[PDB]
């Protein structure tokens, strides 16, 4: 069935599963035509497909050329996402294919179901959680590689850097969702917190800074404050 606060720990068991988010697949800047009408111009997007246990991120880059001459793009994007997730599964060895795919948006259920007909034993599931994966394009290295792509391209990352050496998956996912939720609510502030101390760097092969365990607690606390804070500047509390 659906994934929610009540079955949250199933994410970190030993059944392979993937989250699929499509909110950065079709991206537009809206603008005005010389005639004073409005047009969209597409920019490169990405499918955010993530193993929450291992941190492996399959970042499928969606080049604006995909959309050329197509109609009803917002609808097409859901079907392109489903086509690319299905191709990814067929590319994986059998022992690496997921048992479940959790879509972050319910509109992906039928598109993905139909593309995965060849995989009747892979459960396609929605979720009641409001996951912050839309903020993935606030991670500088992921944004950079998407905008620079000149062709369709798949790039592989570990979104947990080296965290699993010191913490569990449950803890790593919680950290990830805290960071992403903070970048989503106030990107400017979130990014100030991460880069405040010039002495803490981001390794060439990592996405996030190299915080000690003590500094990660300080960071995490600063992110929580922000997420509440911005909950007061919005709701006035």
């Amino acid at each position: 069935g659906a994934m929610n606060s009540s079955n949250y720990a199933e994410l970190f068991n030993n059944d392979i599963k993937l989250f699929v988010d499509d909110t950065n697949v079709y991206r537009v800047t809206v603008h005005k035509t010389f005639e004073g009408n409005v047009a969209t111009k597409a920019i490169n997007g990405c499918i955010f497909t993530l193993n929450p246990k291992t941190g492996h991120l399959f970042l499928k880059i969606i080049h604006t050329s995909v959309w050329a001459g197509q109609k009803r793009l917002s609808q097409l994007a859901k079907w392109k996402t489903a086509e690319e997730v299905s191709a990814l599964v067929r590319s994986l060895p059998k022992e690496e294919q997921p048992k479940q795919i959790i879509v972050t948006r319910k509109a992906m259920l039928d598109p993905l179901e139909v593309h995965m007909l060849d995989f009747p034993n892979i459960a396609i599931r929605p979720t009641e959680l409001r996951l912050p994966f839309s903020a993935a394009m606030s991670i500088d290295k992921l944004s950079d590689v998407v905008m620079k792509a000149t062709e369709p391209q798949m790039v592989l990352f570990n979104i947990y850097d080296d965290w699993l050496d010191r913490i569990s998956s449950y803890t790593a996912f919680s950290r990830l969702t805290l960071l992403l939720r903070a970048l989503k609510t106030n990107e400017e502030s979130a990014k100030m917190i991460l880069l405040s101390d010039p002495t803490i760097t981001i390794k060439s092969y990592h996405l996030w800074p190299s915080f000690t365990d003590e500094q990660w607690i300080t960071i995490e606390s600063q992110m929580r404050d922000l997420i509440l804070t911005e909950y007061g500047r919005k709701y006035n509390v």
Binding site: W79, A82, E83, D110, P111, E113, V114, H115, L117
Partner: protein, 300 residues
């Protein structure tokens, strides 16, 4: 005109023949139904006074033999049987007619309702949906499940309607995933019409039969099948012009014949709103839309 005589009526029962019905009291002198229009299938059906559970009945064609009804006190129902002794039968009938103990199939001459509801329904196709080849007639009741319902238990007692499933490989061409899901024309025209049903007439016959089993027996699987066969046409961008016009006539007479106080259970909101207002054929069903709007604007 043909006749279906009854040996007796030992238990109080409401007897229907096609869209007509009458109440028979316990041991009331009752011996049959006469003046049955030849050239159409017919359905005789029964609802006992004491256990309105199980509506049941028999699909038959008077051209395929002489049929009669006799109550079975062991199995507890009115059973249809065939009489092979032709003279025995005519004699039975003529004597019962002489005693005026038969109800006259009460057809208004103006009225084409039954023809319109059974236009494409053939006994030969019914007998393939209801498998019991030792009898020329077909038993159906409220509780029988469909082959598809079974998939998701007694198969000899199943309704073997054509399986329709919009998220299936039969329905979706490899590599046309989105195209075929949003426009079902491939599944309608190539898979079903050309491949399985062979022509639109056999398609419509199964659609009409499913509706009639839903209406007369409250068969849930039949209602599901009726709605699925409608949705597949309405969700196809490309439908022969002759099918579209005929479908409008078909559905018109089905909604027309439906009981006003059953539209809650026998009609599927989603299918009808989509079919009449959102689908490819939203504008191709004028007569059906018109009678749905004037009669069931609560569903929409």
């Amino acid at each position: 005109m043909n006749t279906v005589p009854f040996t007796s009526a030992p238990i109080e029962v409401t007897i229907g023949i096609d869209q007509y019905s009458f109440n028979v009291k316990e041991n009331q002198p009752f011996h049959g139904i006469k003046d049955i229009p030849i050239g159409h299938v017919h359905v005789i059906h029964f609802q006992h006074a004491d256990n309105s559970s199980m509506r049941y009945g028999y699909w038959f064609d008077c051209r395929m033999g002489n049929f009669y009804i006799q109550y079975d006190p062991k199995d507890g129902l009115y059973k249809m049987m065939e009489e092979r002794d032709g003279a025995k039968f005519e004699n039975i009938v003529h004597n019962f007619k002489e005693r005026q103990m038969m109800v006259s199939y009460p057809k208004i001459d103006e009225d084409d309702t039954w023809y319109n509801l059974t236009e494409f329904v053939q006994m030969d196709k019914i007998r393939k949906i209801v498998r019991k080849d030792e009898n020329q007639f077909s038993y159906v009741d409220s509780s029988m499940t469909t082959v598809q319902e079974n998939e998701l238990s007694d198969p000899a007692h199943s309704l073997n309607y054509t399986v329709i499933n919009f998220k299936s490989r039969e329905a979706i061409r490899p590599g046309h995933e989105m195209e075929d899901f949003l426009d079902k024309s491939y599944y309608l025209n190539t898979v079903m019409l050309q491949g399985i049903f062979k022509n639109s007439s056999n398609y419509f016959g199964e659609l009409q039969f499913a509706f009639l089993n839903a209406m007369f027996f409250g068969n849930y699987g039949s209602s599901l099948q009726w709605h699925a066969m409608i949705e597949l046409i309405c969700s196809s961008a490309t439908v022969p012009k002759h099918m579209l016009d005929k479908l409008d006539e078909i559905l018109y007479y089905q909604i027309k014949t439906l009981p006003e106080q059953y539209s809650d259970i026998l009609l599927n909101e989603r299918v009808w709103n989509i079919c009449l207002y959102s689908s490819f054929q939203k504008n191709s069903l004028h007569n059906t839309e018109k009678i749905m709007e004037n009669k069931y604007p609560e569903l929409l």
